[PDB]
Amino acid sequence: KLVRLPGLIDVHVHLREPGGTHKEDFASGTAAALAGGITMVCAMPNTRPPIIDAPALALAQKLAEAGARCDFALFLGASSENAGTLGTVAGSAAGLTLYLNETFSELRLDSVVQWMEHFETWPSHLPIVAHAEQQTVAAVLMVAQLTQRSVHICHVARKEEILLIKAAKARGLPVTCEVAPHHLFLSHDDLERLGPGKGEVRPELGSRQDVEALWENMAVIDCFASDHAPHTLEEKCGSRPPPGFPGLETMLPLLLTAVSEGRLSLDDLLQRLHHNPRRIFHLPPQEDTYVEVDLEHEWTIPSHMPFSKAHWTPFEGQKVKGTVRRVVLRGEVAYIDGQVLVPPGYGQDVRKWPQGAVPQLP
Amino acid sequence: KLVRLPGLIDVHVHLREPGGTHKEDFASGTAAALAGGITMVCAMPNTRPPIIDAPALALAQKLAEAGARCDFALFLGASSENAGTLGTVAGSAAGLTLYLNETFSELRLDSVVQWMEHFETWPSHLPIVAHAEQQTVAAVLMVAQLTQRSVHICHVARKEEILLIKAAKARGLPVTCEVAPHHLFLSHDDLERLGPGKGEVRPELGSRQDVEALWENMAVIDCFASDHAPHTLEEKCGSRPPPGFPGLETMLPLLLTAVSEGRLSLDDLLQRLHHNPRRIFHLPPQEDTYVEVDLEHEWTIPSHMPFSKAHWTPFEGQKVKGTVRRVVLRGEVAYIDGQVLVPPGYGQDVRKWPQGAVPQLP
Ligand SMILES: O=C(O)c1[nH]c(=O)[nH]c(=O)c1F
Ligand SMILES: O=C(O)c1[nH]c(=O)[nH]c(=O)c1F
Ligand code: NA
Ligand code: NA
Ligand SMILES: [Zn+2]
Ligand SMILES: [Zn+2]
Ligand SMILES: [Zn+2]
Ligand SMILES: [Zn+2]
């Protein structure tokens, strides 16, 4: 007996197109999404060129419309030069992404004053997400308060960070957060097996105490999101390993295993992969869209999942219980038992749907 | 310029049919809903007969399918006799309602042990809501913890109650709550004008400090819901006034006024009248459904709104800014500038839609 779930949403993926298409492209990354039970993705802007201006967004929209197999929204990225320039295209984006720790020079902000300028100029009704680790979480929360608006914290990975967010929520501050599967299911204990190249990720893998703290503080976690960050094995094991793990194809199987073990409920999962993503990012429903899963099937994660061009996975060898059997997207069978059945281009930009515009005062 | 909102959801209405149709019926109460920008309602079970068994639910489903103009779900009610008997129909209901303070004999529970029995027998994946005032909030929260599940607290009306819920959420307990418009926009200061009959409501009107505390603790409020509780003026001013206010037609205009004054944002409103109702009650989206409002039009609430058979309102004389101009429900114009344009029977039971079933483990 299969369980029917709504179409799940991953608010944090890197699809690499334009500019890094040997790692992933819209077609392969959205195939990976569908195979993971995900029918809508929000794509981060740290491509090449990065999505930091209107021409780059226009290019990315057309590449996604031509290549995506599931529905999507595209983030814009904050730079040291673009505050106050994104007003005409802001509402067409998923939101604005601030890279506040390590990143590429084009997305680097050199001063908290630049963070303030983005919070002051980006339209107040539209989402802002931050890559903000350790004390940077507190710092960006301060900027949000000074500018009297909300912020969403990407991939919370540490006891320190979840407890700080917990204290902020206790004070009624408008902050939400997401956690990635590797910060719930991997830890420092896995670095010996992974090795130092494969194991590179930002935020880095936490201690056993970090992992336990995230589980203990599930109530503080608004969303799960993969931070699907594909790189090839050659890149991960070469002389300058880039940080990141692929994760679209493994996220739901890992979390269904946890549900089966009573670590969280099916509802807890659907709040974090469906309802809260919808409400934080003002993402529209998808008509005639659902995912059928088998919660009984036990399997072991192999050395690579079928679709991501990363062609490796840090979860290799983990035993899971839970499988995606079928996905229907807007009335068409999109995935069945390992076969993707919608072509590149089937997916659409949800911000162009009337119901996908973010409501605002005139 | 009009602002487009999604279809709003009111999780707490009394539509009086069967058995009290001079106060309201499905046709009139859902007309009132549409005129208030509400496209989906959850109807409480304290009708005559009350919805406490499968035959009564079957009758109510047919009356609603024949009379409702907007979409709906129907609550079941807990009684001293029905714990352990609702398993076959539970998933067809909005949820289970516990009347833990004053109510009619058929819904009265005489012991906390009966509350425990309902929490133990009602399916663990389905919603439970409670009418629970003052210390009863703490008591039902204890029962929820003993049975290791969630609870939703109806119409929170007091500083005491919102602070207790705030402390429970700080401890990570699974509790949500709603607040009704009269507990945000009326207080003891209005009892002289209303008089003792019209002013009767449960929970009673609070002090100015109660009202201020609810506003100050907006972050703790998950939903707004009207507690539309219609009675005729003759009944409200007679020898044994029943408690309750009509509120479907005034809720959104009152809250839009507050948005216009900067007391909460448009997003804060849409979280509480759309996204959080959806996610707490597992209510499905409504395709091709939206509400257009005018935020500029100033008007004064009259002595009765056009549709509710209550034919009176406690908000008479309040100045508001914000008007519902048009409602589209599933592709048909349902309301325009005071005219309802869908007939009784247009509305449907959302729990019969495939996407309206609550997901559960096999
Ligand atoms: O794009 C990536 O690979 C990437 N990888 C990471 O591990 N963290 C990031 O913040 C990131 F942007
Ligand atoms: O049904 C009603 O009129 C009603 N009225 C109220 O004021 N409170 C209730 O709890 C209620 F059930
Ligand atoms: Na397309
Ligand atoms: Na009908
Ligand atoms: Zn990041
Ligand atoms: Zn990322
Ligand atoms: Zn009540
Ligand atoms: Zn009520």
GROMACS .gro file of C-alpha atoms in nm, chain A residues 1-6 166 169-170 172-173 219 259 266-267 270-271 275-276 278-280 282-283 285-287 295 354-355 359-362, chain B residues 1-6 166 169-170 172-173 219 259 266-267 270-271 275-276 278-280 282-283 285-287 295 354-355 359-362:
model
   68
    1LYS     CA    1   0.000   0.000   0.000
    2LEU     CA    2   0.139   0.334  -0.116
    3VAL     CA    3   0.104   0.664   0.069
    4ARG     CA    4   0.001   0.972  -0.129
    5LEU     CA    5   0.188   1.291  -0.046
    6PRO     CA    6   0.142   1.640  -0.192
  166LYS     CA    7   1.516   2.941   1.918
  169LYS     CA    8   1.167   3.308   1.806
  170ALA     CA    9   1.095   3.316   2.182
  172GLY     CA   10   0.881   3.705   1.869
  173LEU     CA   11   1.133   3.796   1.601
  219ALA     CA   12   1.014   2.237   1.659
  259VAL     CA   13   0.956   0.875   1.005
  266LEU     CA   14   0.467   1.215   0.859
  267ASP     CA   15   0.297   1.548   0.933
  270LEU     CA   16   0.506   1.749   0.528
  271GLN     CA   17   0.509   2.073   0.723
  275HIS     CA   18   0.344   2.375   0.383
  276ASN     CA   19   0.619   2.590   0.536
  278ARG     CA   20   0.484   2.740   0.046
  279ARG     CA   21   0.408   2.997   0.313
  280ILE     CA   22   0.756   3.142   0.363
  282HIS     CA   23   0.465   3.249  -0.121
  283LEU     CA   24   0.485   2.960  -0.363
  285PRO     CA   25  -0.007   2.516  -0.526
  286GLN     CA   26   0.047   2.276  -0.814
  287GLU     CA   27  -0.281   2.143  -0.954
  295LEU     CA   28   0.738   0.306   0.320
  354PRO     CA   29  -0.112   3.453  -1.140
  355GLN     CA   30  -0.130   3.265  -0.811
  359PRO     CA   31   0.073   3.984  -0.273
  360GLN     CA   32   0.163   4.346  -0.198
  361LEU     CA   33   0.000   4.671  -0.099
  362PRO     CA   34  -0.057   4.913  -0.391
  363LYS     CA   35  -0.605   4.948  -0.776
  364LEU     CA   36  -0.726   4.622  -0.622
  365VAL     CA   37  -0.510   4.372  -0.435
  366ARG     CA   38  -0.544   4.003  -0.520
  367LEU     CA   39  -0.546   3.766  -0.224
  368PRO     CA   40  -0.571   3.386  -0.223
  528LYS     CA   41   0.374   3.117   2.435
  531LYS     CA   42   0.570   2.681   2.232
  532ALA     CA   43   0.902   2.789   2.390
  534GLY     CA   44   0.864   2.288   2.184
  535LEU     CA   45   0.516   2.154   2.256
  581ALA     CA   46   0.380   3.600   1.673
  621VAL     CA   47  -0.303   4.632   0.804
  628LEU     CA   48  -0.049   4.187   0.467
  629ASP     CA   49   0.169   3.876   0.492
  632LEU     CA   50  -0.237   3.587   0.491
  633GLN     CA   51  -0.038   3.353   0.712
  637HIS     CA   52  -0.142   2.931   0.499
  638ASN     CA   53  -0.165   2.829   0.865
  640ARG     CA   54  -0.426   2.503   0.540
  641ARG     CA   55  -0.133   2.341   0.718
  642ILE     CA   56  -0.292   2.281   1.059
  644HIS     CA   57  -0.457   1.971   0.605
  645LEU     CA   58  -0.700   2.161   0.387
  647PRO     CA   59  -0.587   2.436  -0.227
  648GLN     CA   60  -0.879   2.570  -0.427
  649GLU     CA   61  -0.799   2.593  -0.799
  657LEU     CA   62  -0.778   4.893   0.065
  716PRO     CA   63  -0.832   1.343  -0.333
  717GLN     CA   64  -0.602   1.626  -0.227
  721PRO     CA   65  -0.204   1.174   0.470
  722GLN     CA   66  -0.145   0.879   0.702
  723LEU     CA   67   0.087   0.584   0.743
  724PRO     CA   68  -0.059   0.252   0.619
   0.00000   0.00000   0.00000
